[PDB]
């Protein structure tokens, strides 16, 4: 997260981190057994970490659970990043509490101008690398479709939308992928891609969770 601030200690109970040798992506806990992330974050083996704030410091609230099923969207396009969304089924149910909890699936599409909350342990610099140990947040508006298509001519698909600032300075970044965009208490977005981080006229591009609500439900039922 570039241009953001440190999240309050217990505030995003649904934020998760995906882990192999190390933290490489975020995710969102949507039921006690299922996580939403990005398809491009797919690995063959993933441990999920819940209840985290400082990924380097054991604080006592964390749950570490291995993925038992990792499921990319059937129509995910590796060249266009169309349908960049993924489900992880945890091998045991997460224990729901003050520090580990579910975020709602959207009941409607995002509306331009809505202020959202984006979070993750992503890079905090637009040039160079500075990876944080503590969870960062960013308040950012949903942009209009015109704004989104103008910044990325010929690249915005039906599964994509933009959140951020055309003037740059504030954005998600590397290691934020798969993490949540939350608007009015609902998960509207999955961190996906962008040109640079926080560059002028290159807002972050996100997967539109609302378009996969039926897919999410059916997949969860098919794998119960």
């Amino acid at each position: 997260i570039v241009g953001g601030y440190t999240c309050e200690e217990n505030s995003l109970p649904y934020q998760v981190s995906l882990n192999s040798g190390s933290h490489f992506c975020g995710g969102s806990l949507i039921s006690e057994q299922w996580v939403v992330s990005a398809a491009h974050c797919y690995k063959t083996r993933i441990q999920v970490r819940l209840g985290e704030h400082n990924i380097k410091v054991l604080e006592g609230n964390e749950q570490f659970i291995n993925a038992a099923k990792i499921i990319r969207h059937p129509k995910y396009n590796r060249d266009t990043l169309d349908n960049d969304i993924m489900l992880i089924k945890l091998s045991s149910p997460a224990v729901i509490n003050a520090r580990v909890s579910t975020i709602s699936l959207p009941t409607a599409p995002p509306a331009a101008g809505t202020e959202c909350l984006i979070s993750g342990w992503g890079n905090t610099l637009s040039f160079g690398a500075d990876y944080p140990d503590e969870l960062k947040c960013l308040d950012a508006p949903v942009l209009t479709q015109a704004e989104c298509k103008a910044s990325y001519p010929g690249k915005i698909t039906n599964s994509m939308f933009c959140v951020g600032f055309l003037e740059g300075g504030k954005d998600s970044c590397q290691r934020d992928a798969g993490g949540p965009v939350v608007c009015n208490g609902q998960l509207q977005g999955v961190v996906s891609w962008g040109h640079g981080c926080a560059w002028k006229n290159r807002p972050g591009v996100y997967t539109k969770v609302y378009n996969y609500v039926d897919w999410i439900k059916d997949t969860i039922a098919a794998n119960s």
Partner: protein, 52 residues
């Protein structure tokens, strides 16, 4: 292929990888975003030095 700059690409994941650096004449680590970029991009240093 062995002379492309290390490109992290548009995706926002953080994946430890290797590229050949012409200036240093040896392979080095970089963080790759997980999609796009170019072929100067290896999983291991040994494999990088193998190709470059």
């Amino acid at each position: 292929v062995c002379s492309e700059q290390a490109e992290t690409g548009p995706c926002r994941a953080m994946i430890s990888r290797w590229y050949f650096d012409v200036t240093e004449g040896k392979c080095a680590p970089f963080f790759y975003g997980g999609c796009g970029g170019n072929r100067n991009n290896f999983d291991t240093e040994e494999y990088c030095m193998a190709v470059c």
